[PDB]
Amino acid sequence: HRTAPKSDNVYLKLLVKLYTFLARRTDAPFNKVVLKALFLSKINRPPVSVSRIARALKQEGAANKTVVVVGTVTDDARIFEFPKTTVAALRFTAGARAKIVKAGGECITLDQLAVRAPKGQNTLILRGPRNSRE
Amino acid sequence: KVYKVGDIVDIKANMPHKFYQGKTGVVYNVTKSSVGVIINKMVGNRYLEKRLNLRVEHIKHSKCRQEFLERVKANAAKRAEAKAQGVAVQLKRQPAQPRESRIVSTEGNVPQTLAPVPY
Amino acid sequence: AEQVAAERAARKAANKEKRAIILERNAAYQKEYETAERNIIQAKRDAKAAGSYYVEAQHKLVFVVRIKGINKIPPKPRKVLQLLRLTRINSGTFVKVTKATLELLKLIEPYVAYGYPSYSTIRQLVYKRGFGKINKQRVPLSDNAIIEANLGKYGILSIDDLIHEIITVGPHFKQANNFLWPFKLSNPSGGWGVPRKFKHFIQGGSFGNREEFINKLVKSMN
RNA sequence: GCCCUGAAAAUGGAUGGCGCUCAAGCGUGUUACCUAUACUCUACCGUCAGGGUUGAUAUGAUGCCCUGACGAGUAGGCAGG
RNA sequence: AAGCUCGUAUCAGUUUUAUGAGGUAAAGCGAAAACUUUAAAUAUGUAAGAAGUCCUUGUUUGAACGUGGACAUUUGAAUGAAGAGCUUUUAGUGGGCCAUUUUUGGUAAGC
RNA sequence: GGAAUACUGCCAGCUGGGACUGAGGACUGCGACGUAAGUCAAGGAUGCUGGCAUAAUGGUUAUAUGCCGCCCGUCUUGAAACACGGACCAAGGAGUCUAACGUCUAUGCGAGUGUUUGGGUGUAAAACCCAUACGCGUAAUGAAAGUGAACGUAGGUUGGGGCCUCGCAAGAGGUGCACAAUCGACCGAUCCUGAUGUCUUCGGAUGGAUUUGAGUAAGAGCAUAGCUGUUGGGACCCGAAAG
């Protein structure tokens, strides 16, 4: 349970504004989860590798699904091929951004995701490995 | 009477030494000469378990869970019938209710008045 | 901005039917009540004229008011006053009479005045101090939309419907009853009688069961 | 059942006092009246809870609005000034 | 509270039912008080459905044990209702009088 | 025999007197009275009339009158009183700095991270720029020599926020992140088994049974700042006998 972020990013505050409006006047269980995720502290938003995304895109029925991470997307070297997809996130590191946009895909932000899917249709949310550490 | 690890029994001694005498617990050991029960005691406002070691003849099985089973089987029967036809069957129990109106008759029964007695 | 006249006409026509439905319902409830009462009178007369005795039905519904304060209560009397929703003094509730609730009523006897309420006192309580619990919040009733749109899934769509479901213990007594927030009465206007209150009503006090004078108590405490 | 005796000292004194005798004493019944930060109704302050509002241009979105129940406090804790 | 996994129709200093325990007669009545045939409580434990029922039967037919489908929420008493469970650790506290209700032992009387 | 009255109860019966309050601020709603437009006591007070415009009302202040209130702080949690401090005034006067570890939050980059020991430059103890090294992290386990992480779609079953499909819903089916439970697979330690073979004793293939570890089973860390915790430094402040 939280109600306002403890951060001081004015851009993050604008994101919270937008997604509070969407959560209030759309009635879809997607915005309600992303707004909650926009409140967590840094230790509770583990980074999501670029290969966990590929691992997720292999599930049967996930050809053109838009994959959404609400934290940071980091690179990976142990994987070699990469599908052609579109990922939405807060931040992409240099390596992960280069890999995605070089394999043909696209790297977008969260507000553009909200405008290409006001209710989060044909999407798929990913969470990082919490307790690989303490 | 032969007991297994896990069954339920009550303590009943056939003098002044110790008095649980009417509790109910689970057998957590069965040795050759005795049996062992545990009992959750209210330690102020917590339930801490005491492990007692009774004897054989000072313990008997319990029937505190026979009515539940018999009622579930009667309910199986009633619900078999309630699917066999379209019937309101009202399986639930009901607490005892207040009585209804009546008309007593003083034909062979004339009311006999009686006053209290002296000293 | 369209829908300028059709909406007003349609809503004013839709309300004019619910009004007639409520008219019919009440006109029937009244006949039922008076017929039952007159029948009981005549049955007593017939037993007397036939040389016999006619006993009535045990009362199905009691009204309970909390009389003593909140200090120096033991725990088992202290928990029944919570399960009865009697949280502060001079608060009242209805209670169905069964062998399961009579023991409750006998466990907290030294702290309550309870008895058997009549149509007039039920009606006055609901018309003056009636407040519903709507998702929370002790909302005054004051209107039929409030009752219908929160208690209508059980055929209750007015306030005489509620009074009926309470006075003749129907199938949805539990739901209708937990709808009503507990009543907050005041002290009695003429006093109590009884120099001292905490003796038995039989023995010249207030607590316990009076069975018929709860009406004279609550009509003044109201 | 009331009433007397049914032991108890020492500066002058205590149904709280004055006083009270078909009582202003004792046992009881019926009423009327006085009175708390307790109960009821209404306003104002705050706290908590649930709903609305991005609709531009309008005056501040840690805002604006509608509804409800609540308020003792040492050690100690959290927040705003 | 720090905080996060969980408000999950499941819970409760409460009553009712089934049953044990007090067994004191004070029910109440005996085969020549001589019962246990059996109350009313007095607070005393346990139990009251989804980790449940049936069909069908492979191993050390009754014991546990495996199996392949049927079973629906007035889904198995009453009242109330959203504040129970792990992890982190962080602050104060760690020893006392009055009264009532049981119980034991007490003498001038206290206790 | 036929009435009456009393007591108890009900009326969505009528009707006088008194006191306190007037929150809200365009309309919206539920009603009622009328054939009719309209009217109303129906989601919070208006209408009429008089006096004064100043010390009249009100605020402050001194006194009088009615009722109330035992002297502050500290220490023993009670006769809770005792006991200890206080003649009066001004100024001074007590949880601070650091080192090392740990939780929590914010920020930067992220399989990486960290410029400031030093070099270059400078408008000169500032700011800007930088090579090679080094620490922590990316691999664990055994006392030690040492050895050192995929049978498979990185696994099997149950539960699981979302998303997808059929559908108005209600539902039904598909895939299922984090995390949880249970059965397995891989690495090291440990007990056996002992192959193609060789410095005649070397090598340890292969298949096996116990527990075991902060192990692997598509990385999550490094640095800075703030609020705090513990330990050491005189360590919240003063006050004492000593070698």
Curated annotation (Swiss-Prot), chain A:
There is a cross-link at K102 (Glycyl lysine isopeptide (Lys-Gly) (interchain with G-Cter in ubiquitin)). The keyword Ribosomal protein applies. It is found in: Cytoplasm. GO terms for molecular function: RNA binding; structural constituent of ribosome. Keywords: Cytoplasm, Isopeptide bond, Methylation, Ribonucleoprotein, Ribosomal protein, Ubl conjugation. GO terms for biological process: cytoplasmic translation. GO terms for cellular component: cytosol; cytosolic large ribosomal subunit. The modification N6,N6,N6-trimethyllysine is found at K36. Component of the large ribosomal subunit (LSU). Mature yeast ribosomes consist of a small (40S) and a large (60S) subunit. The 40S small subunit contains 1 molecule of ribosomal RNA (18S rRNA) and 33 different proteins (encoded by 57 genes). The large 60S subunit contains 3 rRNA molecules (25S, 5.8S and 5S rRNA) and 46 different proteins (encoded by 81 genes). eL18 interacts with NAP1. Component of the ribosome, a large ribonucleoprotein complex responsible for the synthesis of proteins in the cell. The small ribosomal subunit (SSU) binds messenger RNAs (mRNAs) and translates the encoded message by selecting cognate aminoacyl-transfer RNA (tRNA) molecules. The large subunit (LSU) contains the ribosomal catalytic site termed the peptidyl transferase center (PTC), which catalyzes the formation of peptide bonds, thereby polymerizing the amino acids delivered by tRNAs into a polypeptide chain. Belongs to the eukaryotic ribosomal protein eL18 family. There are 2 genes for eL18 in yeast. This is Large ribosomal subunit protein eL18A. It comes from Saccharomyces cerevisiae (strain ATCC 204508 / S288c) (Baker's yeast). The chain holds residues 15 to 148 of 186 of the full protein.
From Swiss-Prot, chain B:
Belongs to the eukaryotic ribosomal protein eL21 family. It comes from the Eukaryota. Its main location: cytoplasm. Component of the large ribosomal subunit (LSU). Mature yeast ribosomes consist of a small (40S) and a large (60S) subunit. The 40S small subunit contains 1 molecule of ribosomal RNA (18S rRNA) and 33 different proteins (encoded by 57 genes). The large 60S subunit contains 3 rRNA molecules (25S, 5.8S and 5S rRNA) and 46 different proteins (encoded by 81 genes). GO terms for biological process: cytoplasmic translation. Keywords: Cytoplasm, Isopeptide bond, Ribonucleoprotein, Ribosomal protein, Ubl conjugation. The keyword Ribosomal protein applies. There is a cross-link at K1 (Glycyl lysine isopeptide (Lys-Gly) (interchain with G-Cter in ubiquitin)). There are 2 genes for eL21 in yeast. This is Large ribosomal subunit protein eL21A. Component of the ribosome, a large ribonucleoprotein complex responsible for the synthesis of proteins in the cell. The small ribosomal subunit (SSU) binds messenger RNAs (mRNAs) and translates the encoded message by selecting cognate aminoacyl-transfer RNA (tRNA) molecules. The large subunit (LSU) contains the ribosomal catalytic site termed the peptidyl transferase center (PTC), which catalyzes the formation of peptide bonds, thereby polymerizing the amino acids delivered by tRNAs into a polypeptide chain. GO terms for cellular component: cytosol; cytosolic large ribosomal subunit. The chain holds residues 32 to 156 of 160 of the full protein. One of its GO terms (molecular function) is structural constituent of ribosome.
UniProtKB/Swiss-Prot annotation, chain C:
Its main location: cytoplasm. Present with 101000 molecules/cell in log phase SD medium. Transmembrane segments: none annotated. Component of the large ribosomal subunit (LSU). Mature yeast ribosomes consist of a small (40S) and a large (60S) subunit. The 40S small subunit contains 1 molecule of ribosomal RNA (18S rRNA) and 33 different proteins (encoded by 57 genes). The large 60S subunit contains 3 rRNA molecules (25S, 5.8S and 5S rRNA) and 46 different proteins (encoded by 81 genes). This is Large ribosomal subunit protein uL30A. It is found in: Cytoplasm. Signal peptide: none annotated. The keyword Kinase does not apply. It comes from the Eukaryota. Pfam families: Ribosomal_L30, Ribosomal_L30_N. GO terms for biological process: cytoplasmic translation; maturation of LSU-rRNA; maturation of LSU-rRNA from tricistronic rRNA transcript (SSU-rRNA, 5.8S rRNA, LSU-rRNA); ribosomal large subunit biogenesis. CDD domains: Ribosomal_L7_archeal_euk (cd01657). InterPro entries: Ribo_uL30_ferredoxin-like_sf (IPR036919), Ribosomal_uL30 (IPR039699), Ribosomal_uL30_CS (IPR018038), Ribosomal_uL30_euk (IPR005998), Ribosomal_uL30_euk_arc (IPR035808), Ribosomal_uL30_ferredoxin-like (IPR016082), Ribosomal_uL30_N_euk (IPR012988). One of its GO terms (molecular function) is structural constituent of ribosome. Component of the ribosome, a large ribonucleoprotein complex responsible for the synthesis of proteins in the cell. The small ribosomal subunit (SSU) binds messenger RNAs (mRNAs) and translates the encoded message by selecting cognate aminoacyl-transfer RNA (tRNA) molecules. The large subunit (LSU) contains the ribosomal catalytic site termed the peptidyl transferase center (PTC), which catalyzes the formation of peptide bonds, thereby polymerizing the amino acids delivered by tRNAs into a polypeptide chain. Belongs to the universal ribosomal protein uL30 family. GO terms for cellular component: cytoplasm; cytosol; cytosolic large ribosomal subunit. The keyword Cytoplasm applies.
